[PDB]
Design a protein around this ligand. Sequence first.
Ligand SMILES: N[C@@H](CC(=O)O)C(=O)O
Lengths: 160, 164
Amino acid sequence: SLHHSQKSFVVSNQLREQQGELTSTWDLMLQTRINLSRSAVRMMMDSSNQQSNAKVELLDSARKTLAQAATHYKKFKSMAPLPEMVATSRNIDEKYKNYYTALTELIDYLDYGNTGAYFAQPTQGMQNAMGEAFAQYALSSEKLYRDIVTDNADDYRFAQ
Amino acid sequence: LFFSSLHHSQKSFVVSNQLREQQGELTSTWDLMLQTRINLSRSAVRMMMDSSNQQSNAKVELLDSARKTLAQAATHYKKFKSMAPLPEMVATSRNIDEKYKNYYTALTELIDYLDYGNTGAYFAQPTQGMQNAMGEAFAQYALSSEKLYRDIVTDNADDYRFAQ
Ligand SMILES: N[C@@H](CC(=O)O)C(=O)O
């Protein structure tokens, strides 16, 4: 009961910050995928094309976005989930790790000139599974957020 | 009212909630623009392949998927625009608009090039810089939004009025 307003401001700030860190992680993972495909385009070009020499710079740019993604994901993990958010957090964890590993595999395939393995990987499915996990998380987070900011949440939900 | 601790007036909740919904619809827009870029690049690389490579057969399906995701991006962006800005957000919203139209148009031109396999025109477009600019505008909008949101919820009069 005591200090309810202050606890509501801190928890609502946390839920927004957690969503923001997941947003950053998703966008950087998509950017990784983009940079990988740009590197693959250079590898498929003939040498005479000015843009073909950039294959390594482009693959390094994918490694950079992927590390940035993982940094934001770490930041997300640094904010303790609220009780009703635990399961959807753990679902993100599972799907994130799968997609992260997929992307690291794609980097390795291009680094070794294995363009066939690169195109064969079912990357889209892994992305879509993480996207679905993000959507479930967002639904849960928004239900909690609406209850907190409208004084319709019992104390147990705020880890009070 | 008391409506709630954070929003003494339920009108404050309307305003603050708008702000969040606007962010949400811009986040969606950006997501789907990036998905469009992915689908385009995955199409374009397959247009560089030999016909005999079985991986080339998806090039059209992927370009169709770009068209789908770009349409969805534009739907979200219209939703964003449908929500009246607060006056403190007008400037950053106009900045988003500038960068969004630049990148959107770029993506539509890429779809048009790939439609007949014009990989040269696709490559020559300086797409990355337009994407990067949109991403920076998005970041800036998000910073501004969050700061304003905190101002509203901690100000607590009732009080904030949408721009006309
Ligand atoms: N499998 C990779 C490369 C591709 O198929 O173009 C991806 O989906 O990003």
